[PDB]
Design a protein around this ligand. Structure first.
Ligand SMILES: *[C@@H]1O[C@H](CO)[C@@H](O[C@@H]2O[C@H](CO)[C@@H](O[C@@H]3O[C@H](CO[C@H]4O[C@H](CO[C@H]5O[C@H](CO)[C@@H](O)[C@H](O)[C@@H]5O)[C@@H](O)[C@H](O[C@H]5O[C@H](CO)[C@@H](O)[C@H](O)[C@@H]5O)[C@@H]4O)[C@@H](O)[C@H](O[C@H]4O[C@H](CO)[C@@H](O)[C@H](O)[C@@H]4O)[C@@H]3O)[C@H](O)[C@H]2NC(C)=O)[C@H](O)[C@H]1NC(C)=O
Ligand SMILES: CC(=O)OCC[N+](C)(C)C
Lengths: 92, 209, 149
């Protein structure tokens, strides 16, 4: 999120690479833990949760880059979202 | 016993062959069997009979990966080409084992769905980000790695294709096509405009929406 | 036999009879009640030969043997679906590098990612095949050619 919302901002690249790293950690856990399906390890559940969160971070970065790179020549600015992000969210 | 009745209960670890059906993996039911019979004594010489219609599962240590949904024993008499005048008896015990999918759901299916979801985000991601191509290529690579994972978990028998594997190949083709069209879009964005392109994308498409 | 030789034991193929005429069983017997079809390998030929080496001494163990042969063909559809098609599709992706604009700044990324994927596929196949130096495997030749390109 702190990475710039403008060209050169590796937001999606960073998010997907960290997701891949967590997937590698998931592979490591899957090797050390039996294929038994009676329960899911809490460490594995944490890994899955972090992967889901990372995919949501990717989605949010895509949305942010979409909004930032919008132009008045191609998109009509929504008054609700504009007013929210301008005043209502910072002053919330 | 004094009546001459002999009871013998030897332990064994049978490593029997089973045709693993890959289609519904990892939600597959496997039907694995054990064909047991007297090798040299034929049915007119030693007759074997099943103790019960079903295997004795009363001492079965519950497996953490497979659930035995059904078990049954069938006695058969068959004639082999070795021995055409003497049919040989066997009892084929079989077990219908259903896989518990939770481990494979966690470690394969959920990541595959997560990376699949990331495919479509490329079309909302602007060209000016420069992240379109890296995103789609990383999705393609991750999907390829997970296909390589699946191909290791599944026998190379070619009798039938798996359905998760078929879905993975379909998703691979879809991602390849998405990357192709993304390259087309990127080249278009950096580009005299023909009348049909303007009529379709600038006039017709927004008018229909 | 190793305990006996052609001087002590004569190996021969099983003879069988039809219409009161005998013939040697010069093939591996497959019994439809006893035989389980392999899911990868189709048995194309299954000959049997009694082999006699005329130069071997009559009292040598190597003079006679019976060899049963299995000429089995791989059922390739599994490998076509799971390996060949993904590898070819990812390989042909490199052709998009030329069409991608130079202003995009992602052409090297695409090309190197295709190279990495091809390297991973070559790693996979080299695990599935022996390190025989007799010939390069067909898919291995394809992978090397693709990586060079
Ligand atoms: C999982 O996989 C396993 C295998 O891997 C599979 O197991 C099969 O299960 C089915 C049922 O689901 C079994 O089918 C039943 O087989 C019964 C046994 O049949 C044999 O014995 C019969 C006995 O009759 C006489 O046999 C001799 C004379 O030959 C004599 O000495 C005896 O005293 C006795 O009088 C015999 O008739 C039968 O012959 C069959 O096969 C021959 C040739 O193969 C054919 O010519 C015959 O027509 C006949 O098909 C065989 O030798 C059998 O009793 C039983 O019959 C019931 O059902 C049928 C209809 O299904 C009714 O018509 C009948 O009245 C009975 O109600 C039935 O046929 C099969 O044998 C199993 N096979 C193996 C290899 O184990 C599981 O099903 C799979 N499960 C899944 C996928 O969920
Ligand atoms: C006679 C003899 O040993 O037969 C063994 C083969 N079998 C059990 C398939 C008929």
């Amino acid at each position: 999120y702190f990475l710039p919302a403008q060209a050169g901002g590796q937001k999606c690249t960073v998010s997907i690479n960290v997701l891949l790293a967590q997937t590698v950690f998931l592979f490591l856990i899957a090797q050390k833990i039996p294929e038994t399906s009676l329960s899911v390890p809490l460490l594995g559940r944490f890994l899955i949760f972090v992967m889901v969160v990372a995919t949501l971070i990717v989605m949010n970065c895509v949305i942010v880059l979409n909004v930032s790179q919008r132009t008045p020549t191609t998109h009509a600015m929504s008054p609700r979202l504009r007013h929210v992000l301008l005043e209502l969210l910072p002053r919330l | 016993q004094y009546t001459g009745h002999i009871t013998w209960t030897p332990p064994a670890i049978f490593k029997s062959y089973c045709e693993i059906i890959v289609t519904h993996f990892p939600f597959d039911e496997q039907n694995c069997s054990m064909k047991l019979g007297t090798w040299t004594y034929d049915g007119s010489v030693v007759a074997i009979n099943p103790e019960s219609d079903q295997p004795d599962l009363s001492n079965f240590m519950e497996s953490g990966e497979w659930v035995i949904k059904e078990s049954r024993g069938w006695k058969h008499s068959v004639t082999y080409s070795c021995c055409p005048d003497t049919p040989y008896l066997d009892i084929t015990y079989h077990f219908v084992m259903q896989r518990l999918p939770l481990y494979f759901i966690v470690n394969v299916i959920i990541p595959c769905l997560l990376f699949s979801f990331l495919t479509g985000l490329v079309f909302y991601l602007p060209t000016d980000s420069g992240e379109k191509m890296t995103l789609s290529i990383s999705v393609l690579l991750s999907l390829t790695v997970f296909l390589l994972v699946i191909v290791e978990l599944i026998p190379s028998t070619s009798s039938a294709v798996p359905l998760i594997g078929k879905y993975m190949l379909f998703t691979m083709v879809f991602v390849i096509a998405s990357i192709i069209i993304t390259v087309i879009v990127i080249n278009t964005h950096h580009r005299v405009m023909p009348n049909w392109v303007r009529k379709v994308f600038i006039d017709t498409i927004p008018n229909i929406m | 036999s190793l305990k006996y030789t052609a001087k002590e034991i004569t190996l021969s193929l099983k003879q069988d009879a039809k219409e009161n005429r005998t013939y040697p069983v010069e093939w591996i017997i497959i019994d439809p009640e006893g035989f389980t079809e392999n899911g990868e390998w189709e048995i194309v030929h299954r000959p049997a030969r009694v082999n006699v080496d005329p130069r071997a001494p009559l009292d040598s163990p190597s003079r006679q043997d019976i060899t049963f042969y299995l000429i089995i063909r791989r059922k390739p559809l599994f490998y076509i679906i799971n390996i060949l098609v993904p590898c070819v599709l990812i390989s042909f992706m490199v052709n998009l590098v030329f069409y991608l604009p130079a202003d995009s700044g992602e052409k090297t990324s695409v090309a190197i990612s295709v190279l990495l994927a091809q390297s991973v596929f070559l790693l996979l196949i080299s695990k599935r095949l022996p390190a025989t130096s007799m010939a390069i495997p067909l898919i291995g030749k394809f992978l090397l050619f693709g990586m060079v390109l």
